[model samples]
Target: GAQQRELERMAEVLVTGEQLRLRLHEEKVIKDRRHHLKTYPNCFVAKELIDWLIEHKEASDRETAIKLMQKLADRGIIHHVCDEHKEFKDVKLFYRFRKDDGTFPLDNEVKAFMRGQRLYEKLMSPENTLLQPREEEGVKYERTFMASEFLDWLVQEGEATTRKEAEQLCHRLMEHGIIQHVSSKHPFVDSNLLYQFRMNFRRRRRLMELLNEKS
Candidate 1:
């Protein structure tokens, strides 16, 4: 009751010299964090870096910026980061980072780069083939496959007995623009190659419908 009466009579609040020092210390801490944020990529990328810090609040010291770069690379968003400094377009050390999130809107340059990359990959894809039953010497054809799948299966199965043969077949497929290399992360021999080499949705869908009808 006495304390409550004292509070009721309280007038102007003032900061003591000690209190002022504490406030300055708090501001300095905030300032340091902001400075770190600015040191990364600017704007949205900057916000992402700071937000990342918040999520990693348990971390006593700041995580290396390279850690975040690696994460982006894993997501296929970034190909590589350059260490050297160079001109914007001519830069060799810094890399061309792609937006793989599919959420971030791609600028025209990024979009063009992505398109060019896909085009190059397509050109390098192996020839499309639907392998069929063959009664030739030592031939096995119990499985049916598009050119891409055939390439993958051959590479996987032929690795032990005939690595050279498998590689030659893969090269032949690539020459024909059939199969592709999507990622080092995906399986060494999987259907991901097929999707990477497949046509656009409309034609693919029509062909699929026709094939279904025939079946």
Candidate 2:
């Protein structure tokens, strides 16, 4: 039983990371617009997504790409165009973001939003590398992430498809006061010595533990 429990914790960490990885895809997807036998709004073709992942280097092959999609479906990061045959296959079937997928706030019409699902919550969650500890400058900083490592995790977790995008997002977080340089000495940068956090928190703080103020 001890082995079983140990085996499970890392998987939970992986699961939470996927949430943001896939969220970044939605922005360009729906707006890209899908077409076939009929018009599908806010949806993407199966292979289009698969190929995107490949071109983006998430998975260099198709089989693993499909598996990742199914994994996200199991996590509810995505859904069937109409919830029919929810399991994804390598075809033109369509899917889109959930009404309450709980990442960033959406259109002004968003309803029943709990603080639990806000972007702020998602950003610092244990799975995203925000609250992680790393040693740099001959000092071990706890509850902080070095700049470049955090940027690498941004791409690793699919928060941004590219390094530039990730760097911009990190800088934006600083602008919002969500993250900061530990001593406020350097601005956000793409270097091993770049940043820390908001005097805040995960180092998966959880999809359910979003109510707390610290990791």
The most accurate candidate by TM-score is 2
TM-score of each: 0.19, 0.42
C-alpha lDDT score of every prediction, in listed order: 0.32, 0.57
Give the lDDT of residue 185 in candidate 2.
60
Lowest lDDT sum, 10 consecutive residues, model 2, at 108-117
**What is the lDDT for 47 in model 1?**
33
Query: After superposition, which runs of candidate 2 have C-alpha atoms over 4 Å from their true positions?
Result: 1-27, 32-39, 99-215
Give per-residue CA lDDT, model 2, range 121-210, as digits (tens).
566566754656666667777667678887777777776799998888777665444456865466777886646554232333333322
Q: TM-score for model 1? A: 0.19
What C-alpha lDDT, on a 0 to 100 scale, does residue 112 get in candidate 1?
31
On residues 43-124, what C-alpha lDDT tens digit does candidate 1 reach at each position? 1232343334345442222344334334333333334223232222212122323332234334433333333233333333
